[model samples]
Target: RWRQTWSGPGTTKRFPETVLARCVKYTEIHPEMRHVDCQSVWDAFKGAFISKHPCDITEEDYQPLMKLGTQTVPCNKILLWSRIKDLAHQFTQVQRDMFTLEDTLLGYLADDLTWCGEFDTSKINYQSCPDWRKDCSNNPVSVFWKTVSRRFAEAACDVVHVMLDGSRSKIFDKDSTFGSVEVHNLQPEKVQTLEAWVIHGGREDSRDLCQDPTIKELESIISKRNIQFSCKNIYRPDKFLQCVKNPEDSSC
Candidate 1:
């Protein structure tokens, strides 16, 4: 009989110093971040989530770190998205004026990094981090993103744009990162208008996303909060490029 090898979640070493250095590099180049202490910011972040039960971390716990890393975004330039992350990022990359949470210092350093606290232990354990769907409320990664998303929305001013996937029956999902966190966190008084840009993959069913019941709910919510709301449909080969290198310009 052949013996089988056992595999477990391998240890992923934490590199606090690497993240700290990146934070410092960004701060040095960005005029608004000249006063930030990257190491201290990292320390505050570690203190907020490390050594605590993974199930005990909350968004409020990360608030202190947020204060240290927050930066001012230009009014009417914020872009929030759901289900179209790749396209949304491409839009931001091409249009440098538009910014997303990943453009911020805190969001930059923490994006895609995974970490969690072990039960009854003070050491940071990287191997067995809980998945977001398992315990979203208390998981370290989920909490961090939630906190950042909330702050990002709160920081928005003037006009804000949201990119939603119109191919899906429900254009806006109440449980998504944008719907659950960003929309709720937006300040009614600060945000002058909410523009929903729905992106469909192909030209077959090109229609405005406003007709969707979910988007209607979103409109109602924003209207109730006294913010102006509008929706537009973007189809492929026109505003959206199927390929970055060979973009067709005359399709619109």
Candidate 2:
């Protein structure tokens, strides 16, 4: 359900002018907003991010980040971009460990990757290292991670203001409340419910796992700050537009 809400346009559809138009409109609406031009911001972030440690990146020598075909960007660049996008999603799990301000911001940064790339699935193989790899300085994934992390940091610092504006902001509660529970802790409630259902079990098994009190407790604990932020990319392409314009958004 969560995926459906923010997935935006699926992995197809080229030259997303509708989304680009919205982004442009958003920029015009908030001229004073701190975000740099989208292209420049993304490129600057990419440079710094790719150079971080664990990334096999060399400042002098690196593949260009773009698409393949007539305009053809290096395959490595595209693949690496996709990899970091997934890594951002994975970063959310860290929040489950303990509640922290840095962790919360990082989660939002991580979430930005949700719509990074919507094209090219060629360099996805973990086996061959894709077509873009050369005798480079770091491992494939590490290099990729460095690139994305940098992008997140830059975008948050410079571009987030346009999206944030004054509409979605909230105060955070440092103190842990009993109402919240961590996802890790909530897992056990299933066992408890099942135990109740067997010969030694009972009707409690039928209860929605999400509704369990223990699950609630775990969620509250994991979520350190209950701040309301608009975690969305409203400028992203509309799926409905794709259907009307092309009927078929992808060749595959």
Candidate 3:
């Protein structure tokens, strides 16, 4: 998957060395190689938001931004401009700090799910989940649900907040309606239990995961419209469903 190397603005979205180091560290820990199909969970993590910036990578300029003082940043841009010339300084350390936080907390959780599959099939029959991953144990599937779904929902909300940040009277939060989701590589019947659990939470007003203070504030703006949603157990039985007439058709 290593493509030919190219240098210059817009040639590629640079993956910082720190991110690579963290990936190597994770691989060393989770040697079994689950979720190896995932294009670097860290890459997925970065790609999910890396495009938000409007800068280009160039060969001559390719130096650790972490070391460059913030003042070195030129002041000119479509967004944030160079007003914060010391921007690099502000986030170099801060980004490393965030790297540590995301790597250890979300990173490890994601790593576990990638290899182990977030849902524990055996747990359904067990009196309790003894082999549950080291991460949160309320529900294995909930772990991934909590991570990706909540983050996506929160990002959607942030979009609205950015548009309505200065509005005085009131504004509706689009994210409250977004709800939770799950991306699965398994059959629906196998995930039925998880679907039921997620649906149950939504009906109970318990699916909220926008725990950050800023997200909570945004949620408040749209509380009245908040609706619980989930992608689990969407189709009941496969046999009776009209959408899956073909035996090989497993879209449901």
Candidate 4:
């Protein structure tokens, strides 16, 4: 079709129509999203990036889309995560008493889909797209998250929740979206407390994330922001829950 007018030099293929359809699809299904005109939302979304270079979609570009999808999260219901994607989703969708970025309108719409613009034409690249992290740090997807996550952080109120992976040698990381974007964007005056949970892998961790140096540094940063900070290391279900391996296994 006419929309398939351009392409790119990268690894991920562009799927334009799916983005448009999914945008419309969710608005009809989600009750709170019924008020959002998905058409207008789609237009604002594409307008922000489609005609620019793949790496040129700045955080300010999505400002209008942000306003269009703006919905206030309850004071203490918001939850943010980093790196540990699936576990966090499982925890939120099946396990939340907490709401996450993906539960938000723009967040849900663009969840797993990939897209990028062609500076050469109006159509998005149909073949492939750049790596947001390695190819271009300011790529469309990266800018989109920075933009939306900042808005999400600005709206954060009361006690805010964060989920981090503690299985790694580091927890208070600087490279992740949570560390780089969301944390700094939160308004210290508006948000009274920052409660972070560092989740170890399947079993419990001997090292306490709560007392680690980076976490202490994280607390110092949060404290200087004038928001009270607290952290804890949490364990996931292991042998303590049920048969984790198999019937023949020693633990089982």
lDDT of 2 by residue, 1-252 (tens): 343312123222322333344335544553442242545433432443332332234422223431100121121111111212232222323333111111222222222231222113322121222122332334333343343333322222111111111111111112211111111222321211101000101223232333344334433543333321122222212332343345565631
TM-score of each: 0.83, 0.23, 0.21, 0.83
Q: What is candidate 3's lDDT per residue for 82-143, written digit by digit as tens?
A: 11213212332332311211223243334322211113231111122212234233333233
Q: Residue 84, candidate 1: how far off, in angstroms? A: 1.8
Instruction: List ranges where model 2 is wrong by over 4 Å.
Output: 1-25, 29-35, 49-252
Predicted structure 1: lDDT:
0.78
Alpha-carbon RMSD of each model: 4.4, 18.9, 22.2, 5.6
- The number of clashing residue pairs in model 4 is 0
Error of 1 at 150 (Å): 1.5
Candidate order by decreasing lDDT: 1, 4, 3, 2
Model 2: lDDT equals 0.26
- Which scores higher on TM-score, 2 or 3? 2
- Candidate 1: residue 112 lDDT (0-100): 59
**How much is 119 displaced in model 3, in angstroms?**
38
Per-residue lDDT tens digits for candidate 4, residues 68-185, read 8988677578888887767667666654567888878888878876677778788766566766545677777778888888888888889998888777677878777888888898
lDDT of 1 by residue, 1-252 (tens): 142111222124655766787788888877888989887898888877777877778877787898888789875799998888777778777646588887789877876577766657677774566655644467777788888888789989999999998888778999898989898888987998999988876657656556889989999988998999999877663445544434566543
Error of 3 at 69 (Å): 34
Query: Taking the candidates one at a time, how many backbone clashes does each contain?
Result: 0, 19, 4, 0
Best model number under lDDT? 1
